[PDB]
Enzyme design. Structure first.
Site, PDB file in Angstrom:
ATOM      1  N   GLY A  79       0.695  -1.105   0.104  1.00 14.93           N
ATOM      2  CA  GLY A  79      -0.139  -0.013  -0.071  1.00 14.93           C
ATOM      3  C   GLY A  79       0.996   1.251   0.036  1.00 14.93           C
ATOM      4  O   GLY A  79       2.096   1.174  -0.233  1.00 14.93           O
ATOM      5  N   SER A  94       6.490  -4.796  -0.973  1.00 12.73           N
ATOM      6  CA  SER A  94       7.573  -3.961  -0.440  1.00 12.73           C
ATOM      7  C   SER A  94       7.306  -3.495   0.674  1.00 12.73           C
ATOM      8  O   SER A  94       8.106  -3.693   1.670  1.00 12.73           O
ATOM      9  CB  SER A  94       7.538  -2.677  -1.632  1.00 12.73           C
ATOM     10  OG  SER A  94       8.329  -3.017  -2.614  1.00 12.73           O
ATOM     11  N   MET A  95       6.182  -2.820   1.132  1.00 11.18           N
ATOM     12  CA  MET A  95       5.628  -2.381   2.495  1.00 11.18           C
ATOM     13  C   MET A  95       5.560  -3.742   3.456  1.00 11.18           C
ATOM     14  O   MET A  95       5.846  -3.558   4.594  1.00 11.18           O
ATOM     15  CB  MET A  95       4.638  -1.577   2.665  1.00 11.18           C
ATOM     16  CG  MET A  95       4.143  -0.858   4.218  1.00 11.18           C
ATOM     17  SD  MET A  95       5.593  -0.364   4.738  1.00 11.18           S
ATOM     18  CE  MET A  95       6.220   0.825   3.784  1.00 11.18           C
ATOM     19  N   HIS A 103      10.266  -4.965  -3.971  1.00  7.24           N
ATOM     20  CA  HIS A 103      10.519  -4.253  -5.314  1.00  7.24           C
ATOM     21  C   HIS A 103      10.609  -2.630  -4.651  1.00  7.24           C
ATOM     22  O   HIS A 103      10.351  -2.348  -3.290  1.00  7.24           O
ATOM     23  CB  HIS A 103       9.589  -4.375  -6.063  1.00  7.24           C
ATOM     24  CG  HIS A 103       8.100  -3.647  -6.049  1.00  7.24           C
ATOM     25  ND1 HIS A 103       7.787  -2.315  -6.372  1.00  7.24           N
ATOM     26  CD2 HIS A 103       7.159  -3.885  -5.281  1.00  7.24           C
ATOM     27  CE1 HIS A 103       6.836  -2.067  -6.150  1.00  7.24           C
ATOM     28  NE2 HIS A 103       6.262  -2.919  -5.386  1.00  7.24           N
ATOM     29  N   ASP A 114      11.973  -5.894  -9.616  1.00 10.59           N
ATOM     30  CA  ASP A 114      10.988  -6.836  -8.962  1.00 10.59           C
ATOM     31  C   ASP A 114      11.683  -8.136  -8.553  1.00 10.59           C
ATOM     32  O   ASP A 114      12.502  -8.818  -9.528  1.00 10.59           O
ATOM     33  CB  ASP A 114       9.725  -7.209  -9.498  1.00 10.59           C
ATOM     34  CG  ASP A 114       8.546  -7.666  -8.638  1.00 10.59           C
ATOM     35  OD1 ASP A 114       8.924  -8.122  -7.710  1.00 10.59           O
ATOM     36  OD2 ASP A 114       7.509  -7.507  -9.110  1.00 10.59           O
TER      37      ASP A 114
END
Ligand code: AGS
Ligand code: MG
Lengths: 190, 369, 180, 191, 172
Positions: free
Chosen positions: A67, A96-97, A121, A170
């Site tokens: 997000g 990622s987060m 990523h 990625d």
């Protein structure tokens, strides 16, 4: 709809939501796209648990696809500040987060399921407009990536040069391979 | 003196009859008094003693034996109730003030509300005070009054009802024991309407039963132990930044008690959590009690200093207080000796001893005969 | 019970109460005085807003909700007692000291209190919510408690003039006992 | 769905939500874009807590990405009007309106977390219509941005000229830079 | 109800209660025993077992548990133990039947079926008493009184695998 579960007490049984009873046992769940309201909700839960008990670990299940980066920073700064170690058990996907949130978890308590997958990523905050304003926006995203990568390397311990090279494109890591890279210290199976 | 003292103390009779009997009772007492020809005259000191017996209240002028006992009353209590020195101070000072004559002429000797964590010695100090002064302890458990209509047993049912003949408990108790100690354990548990009765008891020192008889509370000590204090001991704030929490703490009692009831309390004693050093003393008290029971049978128990320190730490509890010490003392020290005393070496045991082994992490009970 | 208030209706209007045996009482020469605490809580309430509010009328509105209109309509007056100010509280200290002296007169000890000490006692125990009751406790702790210890076990065993004062440097009371 | 956090009291167990439970400790939560309807809620919480305990310190967690300027003024004026000092802890993000509330917090009680950010920029209000209406409307927006610098300068203590120059173009700030810039006083003490 | 627990708390704490008539009930010589432990089948598509240290703490406040002298635990009836329990009923009936003058030839073969039928994991051995009340007592009762075994009788038991019931043999 959330099923109501009765929690037995000496006074008597009191009906509570499934999430509510889990919170009573120090179990906090995370899911869906990270949002300011969602991030602030998990923040209030962390603060309440710390006051209830300042030593017992607070579990944090992350099953989100990623997000807004800014929303996630609030969760990261709240996790480090609290004294109890956060058990970031990844029960599924971790973007990622998602990877940043579990990596922030205190070392020695991070676990991962056998079939979980952690996708890492770089951040993407692409904005279109006048070149003058884009300069500041362009500078800002790199600073977050640098700050996140610096903090990320502090938790994992891998070389900063390698992390940025890998994070440029990625990357997909398996649960066995995740521990090899240092994302999760151990795996929970039984 | 007779007329003034009688009206001040004797409230169940009228002035001409009650005053006259005091004079008559004084002369009669003087009739059998000259064991050594001490029949010269009847003075004011004799009038104070005869009235003290008719109403069963301590004499106005403190004796020299009563005076000596009140000098070391606080020190005597500290030998059994360790810590909470301010509680003893207030109780001892109130008893001294009432005897000296500085008490309130229309209020009880003392009205002290005791709060604090459970197992800190609220009922023990009250029970020990009664035993120390030879005062009949009037115990009323407020757990049997969890309904608004339970007050009928305290003062009695109204006329024309099933309980009119039986009468009230509290009123009759004080009438039978004018000089006694009133203990209301877990006062908070009682219905909020029971506090209304105590209002007149503390303000005017008088309570009226369903039969029209008035109870005299001027010579009774009112103590109401509560567990409200345990609630605010946590002092935890749910926030990123912590707070002192001093002001909010101890203010819950004001919410559950009307300010009227609190405004007439002599003092509101707070019981601090038992200190670690104090737990050792409590263990000594329990061991001493066990030794006295054993000494009746003739057995003598000796406990090593090391065992006491480990025993205390095993049962040390802040929340529950020193109540667990009873269980650990019974389970560990008393239970092994039960089988031996009934049938074994300890039937006529002497010089018994006990100790602990650090590596074993358990107690070692030895016996001799 | 609110229903019990109905019994007083005939008393305050007809002036007579009938018992079980049919005997009629007479309250014409009886001063009926009723003491209640109804609006104390509502006045203690604090408003929640940018601008504060006045709760003077809240005290009476609460009384109207407790006592029936037919009860209040026959009352001769409803006197609203007002919190004891600092000035009247000073006078109350003198009254308690006078009562203390009467108690001390029997013992044969004459107590003297300096005006400075009286002002100090008033400030320590002045509470609007608690009225004059804390003054008794403050006087009791400051004056009665030391005297009791001395009376039963010191110089004041026999009648002896005692004195009280205040130490300005330490802001505490000073007691002087004389035996004679 | 809001989680339930049971509480213990002598009267009994008073079940409550997470936001309301934390509100009892004076911890207000400012989440999402500022608007006319959310500001009313925040000011309501401040008034209730003010009457309860004036001496205690209020705590406002600002995690908003910005909103309508008009709504923000209401929250700021309420904070200054109440006697209790408002502690503004920036969590996650502090946009122009969020930063304005962050600066409004009493001196010595303003803190910023290590990874929080603080973005400030000129108002983006726009109007379309007749030239005469635009002229009067143009005056109001210019008066609002200028007013913002004066109030911001007062709390931060910076000169009006540098704030005006800084707001010409979009700018961002870091956590330690905020202390130096005067938006806050110091980073929250590590516990 | 929680109010009743308070009454018991006062008993265990002081050892005395006050009657509504002013009497004093002495509890200093009474052994206080509190027994603590579902019949409805599992509410599911496929029925499942309903068999049921922290459980007591949850259902009992620490103030009550802390006042107990010792909390004794009772173990679930083992399969081997169940064979012993059913024997007590057979021998109990034997001494009762001895007064009449008969001797039951019953052996472990009969107790095999009675055990499972009598004992239930949830109900325990409560239906065990009823089992002997009808299966073993009612059939013998009628023949014993009709005159065949009044003046001395001999009885037996027979359990057939196919019948899945307890038959009986009478002699005299
Ligand atoms: N300060 C103490 N000094 C000595 N013995 C103590 C002390 N505190 C507790 N005890 C012991 O533990 C017992 C505690 O029971 P109580 O005297 O009723 O006090 P309590 O448990 O605080 O009362 P409740 O439960 O709050 S009404 C005492 O009777 C003593 O045996
Ligand atoms: Mg007690």
């Amino acid at each position: 709809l959330v099923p109501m579960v009765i929690e037995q007490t000496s006074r008597g049984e009191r009906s509570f939501d499934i999430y509510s009873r889990l919170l009573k046992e120090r179990v906090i769940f995370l899911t869906g796209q990270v949002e300011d309201h969602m991030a602030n909700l998990i923040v209030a839960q962390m603060l309440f648990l710390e006051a209830e008990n300042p030593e017992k670990d607070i579990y944090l299940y992350i099953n989100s696809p990623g997000g807004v980066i800014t929303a996630g920073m609030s969760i990261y700064d709240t996790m480090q500040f609290i004294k109890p170690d956060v058990s970031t058990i990844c029960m599924g996907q971790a973007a990622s987060m998602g990877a940043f949130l579990l990596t922030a978890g205190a070392k020695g308590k991070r676990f991962c399921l056998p079939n979980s997958r952690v996708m890492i990523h770089q951040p993407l905050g692409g904005y279109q407009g006048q070149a003058t304003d884009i300069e500041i926006h362009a500078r800002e995203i790199l600073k977050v990536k640098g700050r996140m990568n610096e903090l990320m390397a502090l938790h994992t311990g891998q070389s900063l040069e390698q992390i940025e090279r890998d994070t440029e494109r990625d990357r997909f890591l398996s649960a066995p391979e995740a521990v090899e890279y240092g994302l999760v210290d151990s795996i929970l199976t039984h | 003196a007779a007329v003034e003292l009688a009206v001040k103390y004797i409230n169940d009779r009228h002035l001409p009859d009650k005053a006259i009997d005091v004079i008559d009772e004084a002369g009669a007492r003087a009739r059998l008094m000259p064991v050594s020809k001490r029949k010269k005259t009847v003075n004011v000191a004799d009038i104070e003693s005869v009235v003290a017996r008719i109403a069963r209240i301590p004499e106005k002028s403190v004796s020299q034996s009563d005076r000596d006992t009140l000098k070391n009353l606080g020190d005597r209590l500290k030998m059994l109730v360790f810590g909470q020195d301010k509680a003893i101070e207030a109780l001892t000072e109130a008893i001294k003030m009432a005897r000296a004559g500085l008490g309130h002429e229309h209020k009880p000797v003392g009205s002290f509300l005791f709060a604090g964590p459970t197992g800190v010695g609220k009922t023990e100090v009250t029970v020990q005070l009664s035993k120390a002064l030879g005062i009949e302890l009037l115990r009323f458990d407020m757990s049997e009054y969890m309904e608004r209509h339970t007050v009928s047993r305290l003062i009695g049912a109204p006329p024309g009802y099933v309980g009119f003949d039986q009468g009230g408990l509290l009123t009759d108790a004080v009438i039978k024991h004018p000089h006694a100690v009133l203990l209301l354990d877990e006062i908070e548990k009682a219905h909020p309407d029971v506090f209304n009765i105590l209002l007149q008891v503390m303000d005017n020192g008088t309570l009226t039963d369903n039969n029209g008889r008035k109870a005299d509370f001027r010579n009774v000590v009112l103590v109401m132990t509560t567990n409200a204090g345990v609630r605010e001991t946590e002092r935890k704030s749910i926030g990123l930044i912590h707070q002192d929490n001093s002001t909010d703490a101890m203010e819950e009692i004001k919410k559950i008690f009307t300010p009227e009831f609190r405004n007439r309390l002599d003092n509101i004693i707070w019981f601090d959590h038992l200190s670690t050093d104090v737990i050792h003393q409590v263990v000594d008290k329990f061991i001493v009690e066990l030794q006295v029971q054993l000494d009746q049978k003739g057995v003598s128990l000796e406990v090593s200093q090391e065992a006491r320190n480990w025993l205390a730490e095993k049962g040390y509890d802040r929340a529950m207080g020193a109540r667990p010490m009873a269980r650990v003392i019974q389970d560990n020290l008393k239970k092994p000796l039960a089988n031996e005393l009934l049938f074994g070496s300890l039937v006529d045991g002497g010089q018994v001893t006990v100790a602990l082994d650090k590596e074993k992490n358990e107690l070692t009970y030895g016996f001799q005969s | 019970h609110p229903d019990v208030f109905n019994i007083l209706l005939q008393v305050m209007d007809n002036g007579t109460l009938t018992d079980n045996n049919g005997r009629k009482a007479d309250f014409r020469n009886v001063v009926l005085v009723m003491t209640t605490n109804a609006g104390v809580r509502e006045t203690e309430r604090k408003s929640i807003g940018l601008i504060h509010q006045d709760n003077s009328t809240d005290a009476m509105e609460e009384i109207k909700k407790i006592f029936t209109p037919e009860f209040r309509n026959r009352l001769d007056n409803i006197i609203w007692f007002d919190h004891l100010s600092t000035d009247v509280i000073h006078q109350v200290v003198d009254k308690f000291i006078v009562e203390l002296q009467v108690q001390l007169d029997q013992k044969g000890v004459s107590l003297e209190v300096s005006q400075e000490a009286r002002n100090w006692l008033a400030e320590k125990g002045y509470d609007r919510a608690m009225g004059a009751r804390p003054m008794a406790r403050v006087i009791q702790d400051n004056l009665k408690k030391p005297l009791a210890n001395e009376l039963l076990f010191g110089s004041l065993v026999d009648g002896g003039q005692v004195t009280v004062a205040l130490d300005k440097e330490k802001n505490e009371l000073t007691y002087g006992f004389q035996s004679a």
